[PDB]
Amino acid sequence: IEADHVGSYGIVVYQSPGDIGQYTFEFDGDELFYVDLDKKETIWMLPEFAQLRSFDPQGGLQNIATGKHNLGVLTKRSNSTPATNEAPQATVFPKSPVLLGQPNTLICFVDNIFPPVINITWLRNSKSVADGVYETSFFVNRDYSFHKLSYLTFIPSDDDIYDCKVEHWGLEEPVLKHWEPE
Amino acid sequence: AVTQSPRNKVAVTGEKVTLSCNQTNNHNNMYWYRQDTGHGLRLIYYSYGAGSTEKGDIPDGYKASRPSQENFSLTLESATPSQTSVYFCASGDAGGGYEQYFGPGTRLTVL
Amino acid sequence: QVRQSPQSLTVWEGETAILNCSYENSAFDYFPWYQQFPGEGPALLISILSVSDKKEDGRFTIFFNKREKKLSLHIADSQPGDSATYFCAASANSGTYQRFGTGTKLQVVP
Amino acid sequence: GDSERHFVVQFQPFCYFTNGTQRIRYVTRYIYNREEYLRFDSDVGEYRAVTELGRPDAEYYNKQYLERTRAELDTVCRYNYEETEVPTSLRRLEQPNVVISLSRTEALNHHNTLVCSVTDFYPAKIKVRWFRNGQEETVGVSSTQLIRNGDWTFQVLVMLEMTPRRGEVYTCHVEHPSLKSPITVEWRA
Amino acid sequence: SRGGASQYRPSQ
């Protein structure tokens, strides 16, 4: 469908085994928030926003439960039809134009994710970097697969190379998306 | 068609009272209330029903347990006079905009 | 929170019993009234959505006033048998639990 | 449920807004794995089953929920837009950063590429153009599609194939809702 | 300021 604005208030994603779930709110394709199901807390991507609007985390928990319910009913009905593994695609690009010595952020956009289970990590020269890393929830795609983005803060150097490593059940070997200040 | 274990129970301060509930309606949600002159019904604990448990309006001094779809129990690990009331169990569809089905009730006295 | 104006009410069989209710959480969208007879638990009588402003079913009619967050249950042509305690509840546009009120006790004199 | 037998379900609500709230379309999609089996559509006004898999739900859903769902169009869609979007996302204005850079080496005659980087802006609507000595260039020009950063900002890169010369002035012109006046960046040999 | 959400409806 079409519009000037699109709101998704209550996207529910529940999967098994593992009873893995996700509850989010999207607006114009961006994450408003996701409900932390363990903390029972609404996590707004933009803090400022939380100062003006709110959402009771219980709404997410209540509906995540229904997700547990509908799944199963459907796993029983479908005659236990499992999900088919797709192969993720990754793209790496900087938030701002690269300038030697100036703080920037590297972004890894991973698309065509299905099912929504994945490990995305950063490698500075071939060594895993775990600090200064942020990850988004799973965004819904039109075809029902998903995308997700990961971020790495860093200082651009002539002596530094990067790679975004994606691990998924749809890949036979982890995918390394390479990137370096050109 | 909702049932509750003690339909009437009298315990002493400090005792570990445990009212239990049962619902055949095969509902996902279950609730524990308490009626008191001046407060009407007050939710204490509820469940999305698996092994789920959530705090209501007044959960202090209480703890609930939903071991299965049809069983939801309320537990006081140290009875208090302030807990002398009529407890109402309930069940309904996942939600809140859905009708809630109540049990008969349960009068409790600590002394 | 929910509030019920008539702390207590008595009317003679045949008249019109008006009950009042109010809340102040504009997010409330569903309001079900429960009826409780002495000895048993409460039970759903009539429920309305914030979408409409009226709902009828027998002698029972809910008058919902979106703004001012008022609400009232009218029982036209009273009748002994309608005499227990009535409860005005409400839930939000999120899917959160219902929140009841003080509850008005109605006595219908034959 | 033997070994690598993964199962998931998806609920995807949609509030499509056209011209503020003058027109709203509410769509609720029920997906099993990646298959949409049941769907509510305000246009249709009913819970029609999409595929076989959703055959058993239609009747029941229209019974138990039809009224509760139709209402969400007002209590969820219209409400969230006018009460929560208006003060937050619909008010977000982040200004573009704009810089020009050459792709190859700076010398006195090369078929290089000027890149105009327009970054960290919100919302999406934006206009970027290239000018050579005050005249707009549209021939060796190309821009990426809108790049969503995922942090509520976008960027777009616009390339201009050109051959630098003496006293030749290139300009990148950007117009965006967050700018009371357009931004213009200049580049010379 | 309190947002609402589309309720995910259970089956059966």
Side-chain angles (χ1 to χ4, degrees), chain A residues 35-97:
Chain A
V35 173
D36 187 304
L37 302 173
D38 297 303
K39 303 168 72 67
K40 292 206 211 265
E41 194 179 314
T42 305
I43 310 307
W44 295 83
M45 191 179 279
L46 292 183
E48 51 260 47
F49 276 28
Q51 308 298 341
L52 291 65
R53 56 195 292 192
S54 61
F55 177 76
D56 184 338
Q58 220 57 56
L61 302 170
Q62 167 64 80
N63 281 283
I64 273 298
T66 292
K68 183 180 178 185
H69 172 75
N70 286 321
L71 172 77
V73 166
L74 272 292
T75 309
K76 185 183 188 66
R77 183 191 302 177
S78 79
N79 301 293
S80 183
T81 304
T84 312
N85 281 12
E86 285 297 308
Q89 228 172 312
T91 301
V92 180
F93 57 96
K95 181 166 166 64
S96 309

Side-chain angles (χ1 to χ4, degrees), chain D residues 30-46:
Chain D
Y30 287 70
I31 288 72
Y32 169 44
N33 270 315
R34 142 113 87 158
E35 187 200 312
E36 170 178 46
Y37 65 71
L38 178 57
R39 173 200 303 160
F40 170 83
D41 193 328
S42 71
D43 276 356
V44 172
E46 169 186 59

